[PDB]
Amino acid sequence: PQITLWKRPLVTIKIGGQLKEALLDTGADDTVIEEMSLPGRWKPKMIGGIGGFIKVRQYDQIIIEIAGHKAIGTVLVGPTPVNIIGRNLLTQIGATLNF
Amino acid sequence: PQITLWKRPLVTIKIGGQLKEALLDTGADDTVIEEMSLPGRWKPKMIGGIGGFIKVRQYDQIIIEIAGHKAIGTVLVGPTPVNIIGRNLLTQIGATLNF
Ligand SMILES: CC(C)CN(C[C@@H](O)[C@H](Cc1ccccc1)NC(=O)O[C@H]1[C@H]2CO[C@H]3OC[C@@H]1[C@H]3C2)S(=O)(=O)c1ccc(B(O)O)cc1
Ligand SMILES: [Cl-]
Ligand SMILES: [Cl-]
Ligand SMILES: [Cl-]
Ligand SMILES: [Cl-]
Ligand code: NA
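Output (C-alpha cells, whole complex):
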C-alpha cells in the first residue's frame, strides 16, 4: 500500500495469536509494545523518548505480522502510551518514505 | 526521493532563518523542535510520548523548508531530545509510507 499521513498510520498487527493496533513509526528505531506475555527470555533496555526514559523488556526473534506482512524480530515490551512499529520491523516489511 | 529505513530518516530543514537536522517522523502528529525563538504569538501546550509529558510553545503559521520543500503549519518548541517533523508538515510535502 501507499499510506498518506492525513491520519495516524495505524495498522493491525498480530503477535501471540492476538490482534492489536499499532502505529507505523519512522521516528522509532525499535518496536515498542504495551505490556503482554511473550515466550522465552528477555534482556533489559532503557529507552528514551520525548518525556524521558522507560525500562522495557527486550524479546528477540518474535513472530509478528504487520498489516498482513510476516516479520520475525525484536520486540520491546513496556509502559509505552501507544504500540509503535519501528524501523527494525518496517525494514522487514519493505517500507520506505516517499515524496 | 525514496528514503529507505535502514538508518534514521534525517533531513536538513530551514526554520526561523536557521538550519537544523530533523527526523521525518510518521509517529508524530505534530512537528516538535528544540528550543529556539520564532516570531509571532504562541500558546502553551503539554505533549506526551515515551517517558511522559513536556511543556512546549505552540506557534501557528510557521514556514519551514524540509529537504528543499516549503510548507507552512504549526511548530511546537520545547525540550525535545530530537527535532521531529510530524504529520502536520509531512502531508504538505506529499510524503507517503510505501510497502
Ligand atoms: C511515541 C510516539 C507515539 C510519539 N512520538 C514520536 C516518535 O516517533 C518518537 C520520536 C522521538 C525520537 C527520539 C527521541 C524522542 C522522540 N520516537 C520515540 O520515542 O522513539 C524512541 C524509542 C524507539 O526506539 C528508539 O528510537 C528512538 C527512541 C528509542 C526508544 S513523540 O515524539 O513522543 C511525540 C508525541 C507527541 C507529539 B504531538 O502531540 O504532536 C509529537 C511527537
Ligand atoms: Cl529486529
Ligand atoms: Cl541511524
Ligand atoms: Cl498545522
Ligand atoms: Cl495527498
Ligand atoms: Na504565528
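Residues 1-99 of chain B form a domain with the Cathepsin D, subunit A; domain 1 fold (CATH 2.40.70.10).
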